[PDB]
Design a protein around this ligand. Sequence first.
Ligand code: 8RP
Length: 123
Amino acid sequence: SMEQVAMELRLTELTRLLRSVLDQLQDKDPARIFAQPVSLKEVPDYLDHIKHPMDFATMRKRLEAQGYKNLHEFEEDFDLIIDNCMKYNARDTVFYRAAVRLRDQGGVVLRQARREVDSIGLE
Ligand SMILES: COc1cc2c(cc1OC)CN(C(C)=O)CC2
């Protein structure tokens, strides 16, 4: 149907905006602490601690398969990256501190992304 096509154009547009958001967020991680899944070879007990792992590579895979239906679902995954890290690692670690900085700097980006999604009506 034409309606289904229109929907898919909207999803494609959202995906384009979210790709830009994701790039901007990952720039705020120059250490690449959050670029890849935490390795279960180097951290074998990780899944005992964290029930829903997330990282930028995994987000990007879902993104390019148009797997985010709205900004909220994307934000959920971003929050998982930050929140998992702040649980697993202690406050005095480079990991925890990197998560705080990512959260603080990313909020700026996400604040405007929400306005843009609403404004352009991508949902
Ligand atoms: C072995 O290598 C790494 C280990 C970890 C991280 C990053 C790494 O390399 C980039 C990040 N971490 C998080 C997000 O909890 C702690 C574990």
